[PDB]
Amino acid sequence: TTGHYLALTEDQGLLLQDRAKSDTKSTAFSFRASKEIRDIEGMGVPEIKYGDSVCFVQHIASGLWVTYKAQLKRKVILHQEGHMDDGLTLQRCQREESQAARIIRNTTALFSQFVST
Amino acid sequence: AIRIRSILRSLVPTEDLVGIISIPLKLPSLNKDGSISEPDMAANFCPD
């Protein structure tokens, strides 16, 4: 709905960043089965699963882990080691919801420029 | 047939055809001295 990328900005930490500034260094995360320390030319083999698998999100460059800040509406940050309940499950959204979200983004941009030639 | 006609229409608009048909010609004129002044038909716009 916003068109911004999750990123590790220098000034603000974990934050949504513009598509213009989103390079791979700032915006590049990975899913990891656990916190324990190539270009396949095809469909590959299924590794991550919806609902079943518990994924840990790690920043590829900084190596930090996506964890909620200690005090619900918990804040989110990148931390060196992170808690133990940092695993995120994934659920695929329906086609209607994703299409409506992109349409919301486009329409909001258009009308906002029209309600600011 | 429709495809070919559409291609031909896209190539040359009717404005160009009507403009070409409207270009005035230079036809021979009878001089006051009594001699016929015939413009050259090999280096001029002609009805052909």
């Binding site: 990328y5 949504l16 989110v76 499950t89 994934l90 695929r92 486009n106 | 896209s10």
Partner: protein, 219 residues
Amino acid sequence: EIQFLRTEDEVVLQCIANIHKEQRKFCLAAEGLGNRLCFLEPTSEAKYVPPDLCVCNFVLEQSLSVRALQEMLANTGHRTLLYGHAILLRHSFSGMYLTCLTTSRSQTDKLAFDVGLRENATGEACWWTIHPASKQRSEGEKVRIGDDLILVSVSSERYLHLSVSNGNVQVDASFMQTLWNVHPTCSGSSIEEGYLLGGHVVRLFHGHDECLTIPSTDQ
């Protein structure tokens, strides 16, 4: 095979344009609502600016032949593409079909139509013929992944040509020819579902009720 294109295969149509001595690559793209005309999403400087491949994804629905196409028009499985066939491309996002629009907006050219999306596949405007770009490939051969294609509109008999002018890149149906690389993004033989694939829109749940959100969509 891993080097042959089949129907129901999501691919991106990419073209290379040489600008300022640099080979900039672009992908044919369109949007469903609002703007139905095709543009070219730049996928060359992808390390510093993310490319939006959501709207660059087309689906190879059908791969008929010319006589079969004519018979289908007159009447009113995972086939492999062959050079010289008539294919149908469906936008993966909006569900509309790529079409050679009669209306034109190209000042530079005169017989260059437009390329856009249209809701229904009725007529001969939405079918494109495939041709080899080199003498090594010949009519009837199977089209391979990584081969440069030439797409010719069945109705207008115009190439899906990319136009470069003063650093501006556009796509339109014109009598000049441009070579397109059809890069597969998702094979048709992918019935298995339930795992995370690229481009999927997902919700990341923490615990059971908590999910990753933001305060407001308003910017």
